Ligand binder design. Structure first.
Ligand SMILES: CCCCCCCC/C=C\CCCCCCCC(=O)OC[C@H](O)CO
Ligand SMILES: CCCCCCCC/C=C\CCCCCCCC(=O)OC[C@H](O)CO
Ligand SMILES: CCCCCCCC/C=C\CCCCCCCC(=O)OC[C@H](O)CO
Ligand SMILES: CCCCCCCC/C=C\CCCCCCCC(=O)OC[C@H](O)CO
Ligand SMILES: CCCCCCCC/C=C\CCCCCCCC(=O)OC[C@H](O)CO
Ligand SMILES: CCCCCCCCCCCCCCC
Ligand SMILES: CCCCCCCCCCCCCCC
Ligand SMILES: CCCCCCCCCCCCCCC
Ligand SMILES: CCCCCCCCCCCCCCC
Ligand SMILES: CCCCCCCCCCCCCCC
Ligand SMILES: CCCCCCCCCCCCCCC
Ligand SMILES: CCCCCCCCCCCCCCC
Ligand SMILES: [Ca+2]
Ligand SMILES: [Ca+2]
Ligand code: NA
Ligand code: NA
Ligand code: NA
Length: 297
């Protein structure tokens, strides 16, 4: 039982580690095949693939009458993706953002501010429908602007991508299930801590994929994955949750998100996303986890 937990834990870590690199390599190849930028592949295929855990979690939680967990997971993930994921990644591989990606980030910022505003009194199912529609438009707009028989180069590419994605998603699940089994076996299971960590657990794919990308200096892919994941978590995970039940307001977390998103845009536009910017993101992340209410909603 503690043995099984340790086996899942370790296997999960292995699958996350190697799976992330395969997903990155396959995604980079696919980008070249389709003549799109790494940012575009990161913001679309990679972002959505890695946000499948958030979407399922938020949908399930709300369906099970825990809308606090549903929104806690969605917004907590966005904060994790900028504070921790981008923070670490930026230190590993500093990013200078080109003029067109800057505009994509501005659109992201507007979307986040829009979500925060309509969310002041919580999120209804109509809020969800709107955010989902905007999410779809964002994807199509992003692909438009970043764009332009059986081929073994392409097949290998898709295999790498899909197997890598399977690897990170199964890996994250095993890692989390393993941790939970260990905690249970050692009699240190704590529901409040567990729910606090939901958003982190679902963000393990984003974390490992972004670190793998950063190690290969694929800065545009890192940024696309972070920006795209946050949009997927709001227009997808949060939105779907709101379809099952009204989601209670999280005004403090949304304000933290808006502040981090604003900083991300300002750095992108006027500076770079490098070592000191990453240090700041991590510092804000650490302050957030030190001070935000526990329980994940
Ligand atoms: C073909 C590529 C997608 C394959 C499966 C989709 C994801 C299936 C599993 C979704 C699990 C959601 C979950 O409960 O969390 C999992 C996450 O990996 C940790 O928390
Ligand atoms: C298309 C590009 C050009 C246009 C860009 C526009 C960007 C707007 C984003 C933030 C400003 C505030 C938007 C505020 C919308 C508030 C709606 C509202 O008050 O809704 C209340 C309802 O209860 C909620 O569920
Ligand atoms: C992805 C590209 C767009 C990124 C974002 C750009 C700004 C969008 C801002 C306003 C238009 C919003 C949709 C049309 C107006 C909806 C107003 C509203 O409040 O919708 C929910 C409703 O309040 C619930 O009761
Ligand atoms: C502190 C080291 C964390 C290490 C990395 C894994 C983080 C994700 C693990 C559980 C989150 C989702 C749990 C949903 C169920 C929680 C059930 C619960 O009570 O778990 C409490 C236990 O304390 C949990 O270790
Ligand atoms: C070969 C293995 C290479 C591994 C490389 C690992 C890099 C890990 C980065 C941070 C660890 C964070 C540990 C604690 C994680 C949960 C933190 C938390 O409090 O999450 C709250 C919320 O759910 C979300 O913000
Ligand atoms: C996993 C689902 C991914 C859906 C991605 C939609 C946009 C694809 C853009 C591909 C490159 C052009
Ligand atoms: C023009 C290329 C992109 C076309 C639109 C792709 C839309 C993909 C939407 C995925 C949505 C996942 C969450 C659904 C609730
Ligand atoms: C640019 C507007 C951002 C709003 C960001 C989220 C927080 C709104 C906080 C409102 C605080 C007072 C609430 C009274 C119910
Ligand atoms: C220069 C812009 C970034 C400044 C970062 C300060 C970080 C302090 C961390 C403690
Ligand atoms: C490749 C050289 C990397 C040097 C990285 C220094 C990283 C410092 C991270 C500090 C995080 C601080 C959070 C508040 C204490
Ligand atoms: C709700 C009240 C939260 C109070 C948190 C007080 C401590 C904040 C510490 C920030 C710095 C943590 C170490 C980096
Ligand atoms: C919901 C509220 C939970 C408690 C919040 C206390 C203040 C947290 C401020 C965090 C600032 C993080 C860096 C911007
Ligand atoms: Ca995720
Ligand atoms: Ca609302
Ligand atoms: Na994602
Ligand atoms: Na998450
Ligand atoms: Na995410």
């Amino acid at each position: 039982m503690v043995i099984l937990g340790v086996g899942y834990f370790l296997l999960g870590l292995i699958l996350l580690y190697y799976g992330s690199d395969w997903f990155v390599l396959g995604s980079e190849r696919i980008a070249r095949h389709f003549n799109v930028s790494n940012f575009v592949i990161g913001a679309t295929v990679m972002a959505i693939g890695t946000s499948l855990p958030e979407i399922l979690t938020s949908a399930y939680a709300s369906y099970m009458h825990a809308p606090g967990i549903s929104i806690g997971n969605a917004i907590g993930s966005c904060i994790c993706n900028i504070g921790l994921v981008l923070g670490l990644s930026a230190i590993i591989s500093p990013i200078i953002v080109d003029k067109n990606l800057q505009k994509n980030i501005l659109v992201y910022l507007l979307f986040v501010i829009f979500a925060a505003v309509i969310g002041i009194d919580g999120f209804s199912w109509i809020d969800g429908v709107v955010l989902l529609i905007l999410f779809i438009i964002y994807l199509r707009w992003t692909v438009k602007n970043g764009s332009a028989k059986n081929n073994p180069s392409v097949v290998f590419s898709l295999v790498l991508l899909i197997i890598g994605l399977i690897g990170v998603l199964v890996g994250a699940e095993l890692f989390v299930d393993g941790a939970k089994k260990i905690a249970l076996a050692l009699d240190i299971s704590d529901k409040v801590i567990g729910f606090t960590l939901v958003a982190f657990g679902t963000s393990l794919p984003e974390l490992m994929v972004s670190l793998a990308a950063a190690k290969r200096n694929l800065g545009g892919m890192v940024l696309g994955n972070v920006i795209g994941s946050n949009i997927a978590d709001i227009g997808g995970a949060l939105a779907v949750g709101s379809l099952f039940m009204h989601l209670p307001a999280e005004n403090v977390q949304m304000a933290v998100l808006v502040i981090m998103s604003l900083l991300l845009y300002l750095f992108a536009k006027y500076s770079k996303i490098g070592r000191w910017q990453g240090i700041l993101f991590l510092a804000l992340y650490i302050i957030a986890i030190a001070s935000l209410r526990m329980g994940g909603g």
